[PDB]
Amino acid sequence: ALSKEILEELQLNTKFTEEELSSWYQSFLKECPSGRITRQEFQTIYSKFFPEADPKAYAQHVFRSFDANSDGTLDFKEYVIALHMTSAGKTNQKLEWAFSLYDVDGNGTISKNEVLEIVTAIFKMISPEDTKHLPEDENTPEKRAAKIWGFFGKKDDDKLTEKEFIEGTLANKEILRLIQFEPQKVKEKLKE
Ligand SMILES: [Ca+2]
Ligand code: NA
Numbered sequence: 001a002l003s004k005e006i007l008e009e010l011q012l013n014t015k016f017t018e019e020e021l022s023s024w025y026q027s028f029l030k031e032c033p034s035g036r037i038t039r040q041e042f043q044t045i046y047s048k049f050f051p052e053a054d055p056k057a058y059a060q061h062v063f064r065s066f067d068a069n070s071d072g073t074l075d076f077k078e079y080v081i082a083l084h085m086t087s088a089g090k091t092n093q094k095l096e097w098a099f100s101l102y103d104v105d106g107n108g109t110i111s112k113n114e115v116l117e118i119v120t121a122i123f124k125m126i127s128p129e130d131t132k133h134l135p136e137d138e139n140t141p142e143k144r145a146a147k148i149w150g151f152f153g154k155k156d157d158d159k160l161t162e163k164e165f166i167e168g169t170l171a172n173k174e175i176l177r178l179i180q181f182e183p184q185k186v187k188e189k190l191k192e
Pocket of ligand 2: 072
């Protein structure tokens with residue numbers, strides 16, 4: 001079963017009860033009997049549930065951000081939190097995690113190329129139809145990433161720190177809009 005400690009972390013990021021999480025876990029074990037889900041299996045979830053998208057890159061990056069020990073798997077806890085990160089809960093409490101998403105190589109700072117990589121992965125989550133609710137100045141990943149880097153006041157070779165990333169995503173709501181990683185929130189912003 002689930003340790004009381006894991007259950008304690010799964011309510012900072014979910015609102016399911018202990019019994020509910022345990023039932024999901026039992027079902028998880030039938031499909032993933034090692035208690036681990038691989039990157040390809042995780043990607044398959046996203047490919048299935050985002051049919052209008054090309055979600056492979058996005059799902060790979062989300063997976064990476066949660067594979068804390070880099071063993072190529074997520075355990076149940078990490079998988080539950082990952083799904084919730086992409087799909088549930090309020091945005092502002094996710095900003096620290098978002099730093100780990102954007103810091104692709106895990107070296108502790110974000111580079112311009114890393115912003116482009118993640119912006120591109122998220123951009124591919126936008127449907128064909130919604131891709132024309134895109135303003136001209138924001139209609140390619142290159143343009144969106146360029147704007148983000150500009151809002152951070154950065155030169156090409158500069159490194160963006162965690163301190164600055166959190167400040168900017170809290171304070172500048174245009175940075176927030178552009179770095180947004182939940183596909184439904186990206187979609188709703190494009191329409192609204
Ligand atoms: Ca980095
Ligand atoms: Na892992």
